[PDB]
Amino acid sequence: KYVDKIHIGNYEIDAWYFSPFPEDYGKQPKLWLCEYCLKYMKYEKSYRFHLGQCQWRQPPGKEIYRKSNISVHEVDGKDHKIYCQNLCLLAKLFLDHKTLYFDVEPFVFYILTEVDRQGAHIVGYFSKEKESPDGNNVSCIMILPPYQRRGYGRFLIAFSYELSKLESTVGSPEKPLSDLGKLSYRSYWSSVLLENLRDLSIKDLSQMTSITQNDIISTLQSLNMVKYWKGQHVICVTPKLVEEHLKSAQYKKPPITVDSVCLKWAPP
């Protein structure tokens, strides 16, 4: 039998996918997770005890972003191994394609939290290879179900590209994307590109946004804003065509935005 339900913080969450918590753990009905250190436990009683003893009230590593009560922590898999393993097992409950859980040393993890008087509460994360041959600026990205559809995922995507910009390089999420992942990246790419054509070659857009030319082209194609002339993709849009898309119900602007002023981060 698999883990099919977790209790974390004040939430109970049903699993979407198999996650390889150890047999005894992963043959318990429900796992209880400390929302701060992500230790997983078998019993309500061991969970209650731990809550009284655990002194963590935020993720480990460095707080590299903080605006109002939104916080991002940068966590090196090498320095912070158990925590990152616990994070990956948690993540795997909601990711179909994640294959890596214990071998966390090659990754850096960016943890999103909502802060209040009690502590910094985990919302989601993304992982990123320290060295990615495929130029992936995201390995996996996950927002916990009770926080989904509220702009946190868009925030993390935007955040991952701010990192890429600061690294002066283009980046793309590692494939295959979930359907939810595709919806979110298509939505993000479209907004960013449209806004850049409201207020330019594909080469220029890629340099300005750190979106890869491939992702720009596929996005522009879905928007019918590219012409194809003898094997070159050429941007073809009118400033009013741009604005029709942005003004429609399709593109909302009530986001949480990444404020570069609140980002404390120097490139690897």
Ligand SMILES: CC(=O)SCCNC(=O)CCNC(=O)[C@H](O)C(C)(C)COP(=O)(O)OP(=O)(O)OC[C@H]1O[C@@H](n2cnc3c(N)ncnc32)[C@H](O)[C@@H]1OP(=O)(O)O
């Ligand atoms: C590289 C990879 O990691 S691939 C796998 C991606 N990760 C996962 O699948 C983990 C499980 N899924 C998730 O955690 C989330 O669904 C994520 C990370 C994909 C998105 O996070 P969310 O906070 O829910 O997305 P967010 O609120 O920012 O909305 C982003 C956009 O995607 C759309 N969207 C998000 N979820 C849905 C959904 N079920 N149905 C339709 N549209 C959706 C939103 O409408 C929005 O578009 P819009 O601005 O035009 O309205």
Ligand code: NA
């Ligand atoms: Na649920």
Ligand code: NA
């Ligand atoms: Na669920």
Ligand code: NA
């Ligand atoms: Na459910």
Ligand SMILES: [Zn+2]
């Ligand atoms: Zn704990």
